[PDB]
Amino acid sequence: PRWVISMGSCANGGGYYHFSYSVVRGCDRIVPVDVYVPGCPPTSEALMYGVFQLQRKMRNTKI
Amino acid sequence: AFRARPWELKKTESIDVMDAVGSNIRIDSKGVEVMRVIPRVHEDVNEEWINDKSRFACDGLKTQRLTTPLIRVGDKFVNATWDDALSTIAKAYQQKAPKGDEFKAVAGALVEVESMVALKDMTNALGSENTTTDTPNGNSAPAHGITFRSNYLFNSSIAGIEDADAILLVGTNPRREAAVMNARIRKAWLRQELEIASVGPTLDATFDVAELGNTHADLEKALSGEFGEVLKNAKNPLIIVGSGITDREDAGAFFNTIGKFVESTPSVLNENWNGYNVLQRSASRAGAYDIGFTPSDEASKTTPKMVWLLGADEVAASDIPADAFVVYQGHNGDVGAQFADVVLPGAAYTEKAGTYVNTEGRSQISRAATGPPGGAREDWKILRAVSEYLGVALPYEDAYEVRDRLAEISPSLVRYDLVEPTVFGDVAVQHSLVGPNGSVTPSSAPLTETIENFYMTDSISRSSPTMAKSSIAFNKDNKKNQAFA
Amino acid sequence: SYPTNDIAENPYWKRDHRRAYPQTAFFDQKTVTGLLELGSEATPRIADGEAGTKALANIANGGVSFTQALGKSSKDVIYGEVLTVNGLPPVAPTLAPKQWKIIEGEAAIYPKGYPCRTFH
Amino acid sequence: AIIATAFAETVKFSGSKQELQKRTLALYRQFLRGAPTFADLYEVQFSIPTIRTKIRQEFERHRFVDDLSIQNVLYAKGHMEYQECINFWKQQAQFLKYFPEEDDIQGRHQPSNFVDKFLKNRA
Amino acid sequence: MNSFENLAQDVNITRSGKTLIAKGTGGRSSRTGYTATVFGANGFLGSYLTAKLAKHGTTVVVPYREEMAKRHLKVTGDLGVVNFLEMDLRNLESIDEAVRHSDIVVNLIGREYETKNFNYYDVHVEGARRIAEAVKKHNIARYIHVSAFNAEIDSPSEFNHTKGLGEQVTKDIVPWATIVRPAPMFGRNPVHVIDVAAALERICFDDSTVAQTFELYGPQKFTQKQIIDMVSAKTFNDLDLTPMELPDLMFKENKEKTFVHIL
Amino acid sequence: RYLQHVSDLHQYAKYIMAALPKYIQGFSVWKDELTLHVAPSAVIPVTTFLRDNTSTQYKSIIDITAVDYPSRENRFEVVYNFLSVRHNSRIRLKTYATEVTPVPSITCLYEGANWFEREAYDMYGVFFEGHPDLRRIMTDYGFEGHPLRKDFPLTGYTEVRWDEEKRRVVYEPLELTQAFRNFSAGSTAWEPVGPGRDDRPDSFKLPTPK
Amino acid sequence: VPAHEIVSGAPAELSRNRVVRIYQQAKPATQSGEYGTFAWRLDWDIVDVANRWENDLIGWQSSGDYMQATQMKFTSKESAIKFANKQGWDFYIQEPHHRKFRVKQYANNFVHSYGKLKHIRTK
Numbered sequence A: 001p002r003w004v005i006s007m008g009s010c011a012n013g014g015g016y017y018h019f020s021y022s023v024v025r026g027c028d029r030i031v032p033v034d035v036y037v038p039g040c041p042p043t044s045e046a047l048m049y050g051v052f053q054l055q056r057k058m059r060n061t062k063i
Numbered sequence B: 001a002f003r004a005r006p007w008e009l010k011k012t013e014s015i016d017v018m019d020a021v022g023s024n025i026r027i028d029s030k031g032v033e034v035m036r037v038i039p040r041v042h043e044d045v046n047e048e049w050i051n052d053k054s055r056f057a058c059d060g061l062k063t064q065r066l067t068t069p070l071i072r073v074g075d076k077f078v079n080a081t082w083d084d085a086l087s088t089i090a091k092a093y094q095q096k097a098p099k100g101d102e103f104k105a106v107a108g109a110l111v112e113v114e115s116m117v118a119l120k121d122m123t124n125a126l127g128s129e130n131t132t133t134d135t136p137n138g139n140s141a142p143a144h145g146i147t148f149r150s151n152y153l154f155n156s157s158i159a160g161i162e163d164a165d166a167i168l169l170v171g172t173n174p175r176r177e178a179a180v181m182n183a184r185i186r187k188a189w190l191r192q193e194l195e196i197a198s199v200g201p202t203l204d205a206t207f208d209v210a211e212l213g214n215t216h217a218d219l220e221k222a223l224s225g226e227f228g229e230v231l232k233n234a235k236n237p238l239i240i241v242g243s244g245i246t247d248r249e250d251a252g253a254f255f256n257t258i259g260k261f262v263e264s265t266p267s268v269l270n271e272n273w274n275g276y277n278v279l280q281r282s283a284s285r286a287g288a289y290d291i292g293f294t295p296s297d298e299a300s301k302t303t304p305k306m307v308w309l310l311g312a313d314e315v316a317a318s319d320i321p322a323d324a325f326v327v328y329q330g331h332n333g334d335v336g337a338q339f340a341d342v343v344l345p346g347a348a349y350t351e352k353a354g355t356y357v358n359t360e361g362r363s364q365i366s367r368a369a370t371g372p373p374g375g376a377r378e379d380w381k382i383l384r385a386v387s388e389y390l391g392v393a394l395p396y397e398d399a400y401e402v403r404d405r406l407a408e409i410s411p412s413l414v415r416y417d418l419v420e421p422t423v424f425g426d427v428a429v430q431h432s433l434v435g436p437n438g439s440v441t442p443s444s445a446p447l448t449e450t451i452e453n454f455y456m457t458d459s460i461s462r463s464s465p466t467m468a469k470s471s472i473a474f475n476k477d478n479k480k481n482q483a484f485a
Numbered sequence C: 001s002y003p004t005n006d007i008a009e010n011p012y013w014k015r016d017h018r019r020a021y022p023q024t025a026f027f028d029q030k031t032v033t034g035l036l037e038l039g040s041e042a043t044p045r046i047a048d049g050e051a052g053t054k055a056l057a058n059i060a061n062g063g064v065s066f067t068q069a070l071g072k073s074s075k076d077v078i079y080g081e082v083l084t085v086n087g088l089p090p091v092a093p094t095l096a097p098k099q100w101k102i103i104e105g106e107a108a109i110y111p112k113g114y115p116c117r118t119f120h
Numbered sequence D: 001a002i003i004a005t006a007f008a009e010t011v012k013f014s015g016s017k018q019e020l021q022k023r024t025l026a027l028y029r030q031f032l033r034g035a036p037t038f039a040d041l042y043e044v045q046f047s048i049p050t051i052r053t054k055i056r057q058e059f060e061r062h063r064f065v066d067d068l069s070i071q072n073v074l075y076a077k078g079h080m081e082y083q084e085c086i087n088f089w090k091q092q093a094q095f096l097k098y099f100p101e102e103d104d105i106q107g108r109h110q111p112s113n114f115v116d117k118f119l120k121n122r123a
Numbered sequence E: 001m002n003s004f005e006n007l008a009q010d011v012n013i014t015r016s017g018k019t020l021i022a023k024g025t026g027g028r029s030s031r032t033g034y035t036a037t038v039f040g041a042n043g044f045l046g047s048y049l050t051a052k053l054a055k056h057g058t059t060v061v062v063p064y065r066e067e068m069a070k071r072h073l074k075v076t077g078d079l080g081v082v083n084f085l086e087m088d089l090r091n092l093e094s095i096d097e098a099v100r101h102s103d104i105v106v107n108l109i110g111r112e113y114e115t116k117n118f119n120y121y122d123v124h125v126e127g128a129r130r131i132a133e134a135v136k137k138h139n140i141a142r143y144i145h146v147s148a149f150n151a152e153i154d155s156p157s158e159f160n161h162t163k164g165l166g167e168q169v170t171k172d173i174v175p176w177a178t179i180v181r182p183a184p185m186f187g188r189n190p191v192h193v194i195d196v197a198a199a200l201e202r203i204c205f206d207d208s209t210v211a212q213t214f215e216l217y218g219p220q221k222f223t224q225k226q227i228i229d230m231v232s233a234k235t236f237n238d239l240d241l242t243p244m245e246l247p248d249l250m251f252k253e254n255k256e257k258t259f260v261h262i263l
Numbered sequence F: 001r002y003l004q005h006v007s008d009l010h011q012y013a014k015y016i017m018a019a020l021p022k023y024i025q026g027f028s029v030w031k032d033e034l035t036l037h038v039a040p041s042a043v044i045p046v047t048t049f050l051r052d053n054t055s056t057q058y059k060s061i062i063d064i065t066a067v068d069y070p071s072r073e074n075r076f077e078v079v080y081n082f083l084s085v086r087h088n089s090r091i092r093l094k095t096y097a098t099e100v101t102p103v104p105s106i107t108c109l110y111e112g113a114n115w116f117e118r119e120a121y122d123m124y125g126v127f128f129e130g131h132p133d134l135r136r137i138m139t140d141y142g143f144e145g146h147p148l149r150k151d152f153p154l155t156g157y158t159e160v161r162w163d164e165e166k167r168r169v170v171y172e173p174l175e176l177t178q179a180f181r182n183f184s185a186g187s188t189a190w191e192p193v194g195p196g197r198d199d200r201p202d203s204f205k206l207p208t209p210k
Numbered sequence G: 001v002p003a004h005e006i007v008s009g010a011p012a013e014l015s016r017n018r019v020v021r022i023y024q025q026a027k028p029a030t031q032s033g034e035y036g037t038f039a040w041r042l043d044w045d046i047v048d049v050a051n052r053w054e055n056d057l058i059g060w061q062s063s064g065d066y067m068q069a070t071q072m073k074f075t076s077k078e079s080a081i082k083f084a085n086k087q088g089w090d091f092y093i094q095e096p097h098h099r100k101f102r103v104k105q106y107a108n109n110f111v112h113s114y115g116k117l118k119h120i121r122t123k
């Protein structure tokens, strides 16, 4: 029963390095991600708020 | 309005094909659409000046195109699978079965040399050289030789007009046809001492013509009366001819007087420069005659069962038969596509790297700026694949092999942007004189204007609304266009 | 501040430093032979301004060599412009030379027994 | 870094073609001898003879190279590839870069004639 | 570069009359133009199915029952390719909504046991009656109904009986639907599951598979004792496929004296 | 000070060329930076002279790299950077190397240098003959190409995604959702800077006659 | 000419499918500067299907061609052509078109015309 959240802008859709040769354009090509926390350095404010949104999703699952 | 800032634009260096000069443009593209064209500089042909119709007809490049093949069901087309249309063509070839001299293949105005080579190869391996051009009186040989390239080219160079002394135009309006040529004429006439006279319709030039008449009798009277002194006296004259007389069925008697005068007079025709000159109106009709793209005397007599339109926009309803299989290959919808049973979407001049030959004889390549939109393809590859569904296996499948076959027809077309002189011009004037001597009588039909409008021709300017409002805004009926009142 | 954007007397070209940039003084194998034999704009060894350019042009074409220029060089040339005036090789030069103190007493940041010294 | 890694050799450039031929010979022997290790190590689906015929056909690709120093760089690149493969540095998704034609057939309509190229305008 | 080994051409017409032009070269970022709805794509065959289907850029509409079984279907397609919207078999309106813009549509809704909510009659003939009545309502081209082997209309088993019933009802209401019957399936005679999904994608897109029942059975026939000892109509040849063999798939003194041991 | 010091640096480098005429082709100074212009078979003796002389003891490799100009027949130029921590001085050493010919490695002298040499190897494909552990670093293991090289595009040739079928990541040719749009097309069409003055001292430019 | 297409790590299709073009950039007709018209640009002719196409969500100009935004600058045509055939590409050198010298005088703006004026300057 697993989840993943994607912190930052380099980890979703490539980001600052989006046109580089040696980069994966976001971890959507690899892992199925459930919440995105955008921001290039997204403040601990925004990361924690992403975690609260993800906890709501986990509880509404009731697996 | 400008929609793209010039740091966003992608510049592409191509040739214009709307006019016969083949002037240099600069295609600016955001990436699927084309924003503008701007004159790249060339020392000889256009000298940083570009035509109006050359410039503002990128509007018709994106408004009424063909993005899929269509098949006529009866009073209404449907769009189709590519295989559907291209098997429909083979099935109707097997049904009609033209054995020979019944597959008409007419080209049109702005078409690549390589597409004309593909079409001509497909017709001649088919077994029919009913291989004609779009102009009225196109069904015959154009009363001047495919032989000896200096018959149908602009033989003194375009640079040579700067050296001209006293020139006369027949059957043309250089203000309309090849408008950059008029900037060359007026530049020469203003910098030096020149003498113009004109035979044809009463034209308004920028410069100062002298009128001579509206009749081939007026022509012969003018060549015998006072210009056998002027053209004989002149150091570097040139005699210059429209292609609107090849339109006329009485063309050959009009070639007789002028070729006999050039053969008689040794100043218009000598060693270092030739001065018989003609104009064209297209980028292809000066390059189609390099290939030999002309019908035979036997081919003009029959009625075709299967008509091929390649471009071919100014055809009439009477020019094709009623039972004919009339497949169109072009890049936008037009009168020519309205008659068709199958239309085939082709790439326009922007979307293909094509060879084009001007009136001077320069072979020049365009650069493909963007891809053909939706489901259009390149022009010669469509013929290369329709050949496979017929019995014709065209020997090439690669663009370099197209270049080598193109060298085999004539190797001054794989040599680009060089102008060569001709040592055969003296022989060519006599060989162009002998043919039409006594073949046809000069009738008194007055010399009409070659195009009724500048702004609406060549299958792109008909589709663009820029030309559609610029034709009615410049009609010179209104008080704003006229200088007085 | 204001003296940069005064309205009376500010031509841009006086306070201009992007255009008054230095160029890379690149020295060939051959222009150093020219420095050893022609001389210099400080100490020239060339008279006869018409035959000067002729004496210049063979070196500019590859007439003499550099080992030949060193063999033909006098001791005054070698001790003036190759070596130093005392016959010594020059020291690898540094822009702002740094002389070191060692702070030792109670002004140090570690007393005796800790191994860190606090140089200056 | 004083000591090198395990299977490395100092990159050194021969002046003759026969010495290079001896070195590429010993090199093919090293790949072919280490080929049973790669099937265990990278957990491939298939057989050791397919690894061996691939190593062979990757030396078939550069059989007719004339220039000496291009053979030299080609030997150095081949030794670097052996070096990565014989250890666990490459992973099993970069080892299978070498076998794209084996793992799966992508579907119908591999175009052969001009018509099949042309129905999807040379793909 | 990646090519459309999916397609036969670049410009294709569907049966209903819509014109579909493939853009660019085949690959993840491109769009084939087809819109596909796969009922049951959370399951075991539908996962491989819209792995192949959303690989080239067909906009896959995935109807889901549970929010957590669907998540690994997000990484098989590009931005905007795979699209999730919830539905239930019971609520008509969600079936109506899920097939509004589809070009092709498949179901693999198949359950081998009775629940407290659905018996065999409820998921196989009656759910298929429901969604294929919606397919007839919207005139969607190319409907495909995957069924079971041994799908007889009248049988002692209720599963096989109701699979035959679902076939007959969907053939009754839609004449142009195609019903495919695969063998037993072994993803990781029986047929390998990537072969079933390859066969289904080759069913999906061409003409002249219409109203044709298909048998998708592997090369050589087995018994259960033989399988456990190894562990210890139109066929594939219509659509130019060779199924993989089950046996090949089935796996898927002195030196010590001169070393040192106590240091 | 600074005018005197740059005029002193000129003279030091004139001495360095005169001490080793067989190996040093040129020297150029530009603003308290000294570049020594050296043949590729001339690397090792000049670097021993830079390590070993007491006037010239640089002792410490800082960073080395290549730079390609594709418009020259010898494509890459391999530049070395040293730091005399005694004399508080920096020095620079440029050689050249084509894609296929080498330059010899200074890892026999400088112990830090080998890691730098294989870095410049992976970025440029420039060879260091005489080097243990020459192979790639800081790129992908199966990566084909040399990235910091003008024929190599920006986004590269390949991209990575998880194929569901093979249950592994697969490597595929490049497809973008948004194409790269360089805005370098749209630079100035007037010359942006002048030629600029010189910092050559009067002693080291050629005399005019008379 | 040493064939360097096998050493640069580029795929085969970049050497055996695509045509490339040498050109000097023309002088812009809009503005009168000439600074960008001295270096020789090496640039790839577009491919039919993989140039650019509109995205369905926003309308992003997605591409499939990967050399679409690469250009090179060379000093001379000879360096450009030696690099182009050293990497094993098929070029097309486009020769530059300069302006023609013509003597200008400000005293051309008025001369005594003996016949018809045929022109009226304005300044």
Ligand SMILES: NC(=O)C1=CN([C@@H]2O[C@H](COP(=O)(O)OP(=O)(O)OC[C@H]3O[C@@H](n4cnc5c(N)ncnc54)[C@H](OP(=O)(O)O)[C@@H]3O)[C@@H](O)[C@H]2O)C=CC1
Residues within 6 Å of the ligand: E039, E040, E041, E042, E043, E044, E045, E046, E065, E066, E069, E089, E107, E108, E109, E110, E111, E118, E123, E127, E146, E147, E148, E149, E182, E183, E184, E185
């Ligand atoms: N050996 C085999 O595997 C055989 C299977 N088949 C048939 O092929 C098809 C796919 O094969 P297989 O992978 O085994 O089947 P699945 O494991 O995929 O069946 C489950 C899928 O169908 C959905 N499903 C079942 N009932 C319902 C329902 N009332 N409402 C919504 N969804 C429902 C499930 O929803 P959810 O995701 O919520 O669970 C799930 O998506 C099936 O129809 C099967 O009958 C054919 C012959 C043999």
